[PDB]
From a paper:
The nucleosome structure is stabilized by electrostatic interactions between the phosphate backbone of the DNA and positively charged residues on histones. Nucleosomes are highly dynamic and can move along the DNA in an uncatalyzed or chromatin remodeling enzyme-driven way. In this work, we solved cryo-electron microscopy (EM) structures with differently organized histone octamers and DNA. Our structures show conformational changes in the histone octamer that are required for DNA translocation and thermally driven nucleosome sliding.
We collected cryo-EM data of nucleosome core particles (NCPs) assembled on a 601 DNA at physiological conditions. We observed that the X-ray structure fits well into the Class 1, but not into the Class 2 structure. We refined the X-ray model of the nucleosome for both Class 1 and Class 2 cryo-EM maps. In both classes, the resolution of the histone octamer is 4.0 Å or better with many side chains resolved. Although in Class 1 and Class LS20 structures we observe only minor movements, the RMSD data show larger rearrangements in the Class 2 structure. In the Class 1 structure, we observed that the H4 tail interacts with the phosphate backbone of DNA at SHL 2.5.
Residue numbers in the entry:
A (entry chain A): 37 to 134
B (entry chain D), H (entry chain H): 27 to 121
C (entry chain B): 18 to 101
D (entry chain C), G (entry chain G): 9 to 118
E (entry chain E): 38 to 134
F (entry chain F): 18 to 102
The structure:
DNA sequence: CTGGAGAATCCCGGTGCCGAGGCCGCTCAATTGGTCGTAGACAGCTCTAGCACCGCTTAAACGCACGTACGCGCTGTCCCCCGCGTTTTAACCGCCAAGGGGATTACTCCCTAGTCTCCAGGCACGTGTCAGATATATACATCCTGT
DNA sequence: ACAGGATGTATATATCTGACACGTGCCTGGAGACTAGGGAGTAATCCCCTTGGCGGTTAAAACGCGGGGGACAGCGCGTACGTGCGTTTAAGCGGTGCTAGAGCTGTCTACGACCAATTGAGCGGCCTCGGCACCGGGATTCTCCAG
């Protein structure tokens, strides 16, 4: 007989796993290219220190993670377990970014 | 008479008279405007201060002010300010 | 070196977003979130890099340093520890 | 010692705000060891410009409510209706300003 | 009978108080509350009138803003009645608790 | 005639709290909100007034001035325009 | 002048943090026109104290996981598990710190 | 042949040896601690700066530092910090 | 529900490494004695606001009534996102090299504090009248009933 | 859908007040010439990191194959708070008066920059070795699924 886990078990295992570990979750090179692309519209042919790109990725993941924590609390407050765009919009409005 | 405390009252009135000669202003509104001027002032000076410090320079020049303004004021508001300031700076060096 | 990048925003992929959410404590993610997330991140990055480069031009440098990013983060009340 | 006819630095820049007073505040304000000559002119220009920008919208607000003297309410309306100005003063509270009439759509009757 | 349906007078209050600017808390009870809370730091404290007024100004503006955010949280959850949990969520996301 | 005050927290009456919510755009208010609101406001005031007095003791003054409150507000990132500065 | 031997002001205050270095940073830091003699000693004492609190908590956290070298994750856990430190650092992000394990009750299986 | 870039590393290590003699610290963690020290330093000095400004004084004394600490540090942290600070200043007045 | 199964994680134990602790010049920042300007500490005068305090009007607040909309609990439904197999994609990882720029070292000169002085803008001090703050009586929004 | 009617609200008109626009008096901060130090622009160099750029391994993003719970419309019910009536009750408002500490003024002497001379704490750079990072393999728990 086959062997499949129920929805959410592997999800929680990943939550405990990535919450226990501390490595960066975005892929280095694609993100480094996104940074350079976005930076193009301000000054042409910018060079980047390696640590500056790392600091951006670090700050980006920490910022998004915190936003998801608040988005999660908002979703739970509305008797749901699935985060939706309007939850992110609400979170940013309450915080003061939009 | 007493300890004289200064404010931007007369300047807010002169600007008001240039933009709306037939419009007046209540004492409370003048207070609010004075607090606003002191606020924006301290923010710009603070940022210029940080700019001079981070780059180990001991002089706040028009460049630090400009960069500071670009950091504090959102978008087009900063651009016209930078525009006006540029005019101002240019015209000043010719007078 | 006359080079230009396009559509690199697709680099922040689906499994990476779902990873970020998992570290954030999210358990279920609607498919519509990804387009929303790339946009949200873009805005954030747009703001920060803009200020970063703004510092860079003031220093008369052509290379964005890590310190520029740190000061940028400080400028928005999102102070970062561990780079000076 | 009869020196030359003086004239304010604001006038040299064609400005209303006091370049000299701002310069004095800068020297005794603990911001940097020294302050450049163009800094007060540039700063006064920016403050005067922002003051004109808000006072103009305020003036329109007062005219639209049939009053000729500006009071706090018009300032609150003036700031909160200009998106960029709103952003600039997003963490400021204006005394006796009230709020903008904004009722969420779902709460109204039909 | 001429009893108005629930919400009509409420909306009228909303428009009424959103159009005007006077302070909504009674000056004297609030003034006493301020002095009572202040007691636990220094005895026989004196206050400037404008200080007590500034506290009422700040207080009412802070609460009004909290109710705006709270109200958005309530509406989000498909309700039209603000509840303590909504206020707690607001304060939590703002970073005040 | 020195006087020690008690139960002034009840001075932020229920009608006044309703009025505040009305200016905030609130349409319906649960009855349990009012006592909870007094608690919330209390914490806010506790945070602000304490700091105000903290400024007061530094200046060697016996009277809390308006400016003390203004600076207190400034300290918490809630700048207030219209009383001095 | 073949003077008395020198003692660090830190040692005079029985402190490990550099009263001398802090004092210099204050004087050249554009904070006030004058800096009182007791200010750097008092400040150094408070910085060393806060340092000891975070290090002490990180130390405990490290020992409780059988590690002798403090790495960022412990600093994160240390700061965020103390209410007053958490309140002091609510807008700060620690690089490579991660997040405190915190799963909302309603999400655990039923 | 490089340029002297100072730090708080050796002091965090000394304190570390007094509090946990058998515990070490990674490079990145020492960097984080160093940033934390500069952060708290700038905050305290900033509040002391404005405190000095408000009351039109030009000297930062123990009073300003103390009041600034009470303003910035929550509860017991502040209380014990004043205890340690005052004790130390008292001891310093002897030597 | 209650044991049988089967895997994911945890534990236990082993091997070269390079990050971290220590050493060794070695350089400049802390210390330390005077030394002096001047900044805030202290005594004391003025008075205005702060606070204690009386009298009445009335508007703000409190207790109730009731009923109508409001939160919230359950039920049923598509759908859609999660788990895994598979595979292509392309990032990692190492690896080579040319080089651009940045992090410096002379070198200056020019740009901004610093002083004195002159006097004109800026602020208190009144002050008078014109917006203005609320009364009196309009049709119309407007909301509800009832059609 | 569809008028009728009965009440808040904006409209228009009106009367004394005092807030603000303006005059006046007077005062000190802005400016102007001059001086004098030193901060940051300008040139040129080393090297070192930054970036271009090849070859292969393999982790990982991608498609899809179900499929099972999750969001959400809907129904329905019992508190519950809004509206309003009616009644205190106490705040508003004015109205007194005392006085006490703000707030300034005039004394200073103490306390912190200024200077340079000296030298020992801190750093750079460069070592060695020990936790440590990940592999090899068994056990416990963990999750699940059949009796």
């Amino acid at each position: 007989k086959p062997h499949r886990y129920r929805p959410g078990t592997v999800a929680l295992r990943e939550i405990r796993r990535y919450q226990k570990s501390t490595e960066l979750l975005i892929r280095k090179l694609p993100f480094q290219r996104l940074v350079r692309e976005i930076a193009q519209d301000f000054k042409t042919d910018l060079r980047f220190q390696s640590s500056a790109v790392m600091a951006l990725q670090e700050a980006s993941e920490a910022y998004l993670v915190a936003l998801f924590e608040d988005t999660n609390l908002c979703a739970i407050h509305a008797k749901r377990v699935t985060i939706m765009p309007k939850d992110i919009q609400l979170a940013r409005r309450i915080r003061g970014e939009r | 008479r007493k300890t004289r405390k200064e404010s931007y009252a007369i300047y807010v009135y002169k600007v008001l008279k240039q933009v709306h000669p037939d419009t007046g202003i209540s004492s409370k509104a003048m207070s609010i405007m004075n607090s606003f001027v002191n606020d924006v002032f301290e923010r710009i000076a603070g940022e210029a201060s940080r700019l001079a410090h981070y780059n180990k320079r001991s002089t706040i020049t028009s460049r630090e002010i400009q960069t500071a303004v670009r950091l504090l004021l959102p978008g087009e508001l900063a651009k016209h300010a930078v525009s006006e300031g540029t005019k101002a700076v240019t015209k000043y060096t010719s007078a | 070196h006359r080079k230009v990048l396009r559509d690199n925003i697709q680099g922040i992929t689906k499994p990476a977003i779902r990873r970020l959410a998992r570290r954030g404590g999210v358990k279920r993610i609607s498919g519509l979130i990804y387009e929303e997330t790339r946009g949200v991140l873009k805005v954030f990055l747009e703001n920060v890099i803009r200020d970063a480069v703004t510092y860079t031009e003031h220093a008369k440098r052509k290379t964005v340093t890590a310190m520029d990013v740190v000061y940028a983060l400080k400028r928005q009340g999102r102070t970062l520890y561990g780079f000076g | 010692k009869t020196r030359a006819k003086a004239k304010t630095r604001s006038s040299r820049a064609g400005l209303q705000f006091p370049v000299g007073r701002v310069h004095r505040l800068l020297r005794k304000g603990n911001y940097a060891e020294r302050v450049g000559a163009g800094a007060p002119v540039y700063l006064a220009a920016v403050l005067e410009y922002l003051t004109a920008e808000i006072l103009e919208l305020a003036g329109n607000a007062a005219r639209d409510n049939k009053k000729t003297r500006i009071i706090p309410r018009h300032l609150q309306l003036a700031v909160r209706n200009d998106e960029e100005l709103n952003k600039l003063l997003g963490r400021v509270t204006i005394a006796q300003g009230g709020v903008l009439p904004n009722i969420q759509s779902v709460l109204l009757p039909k």
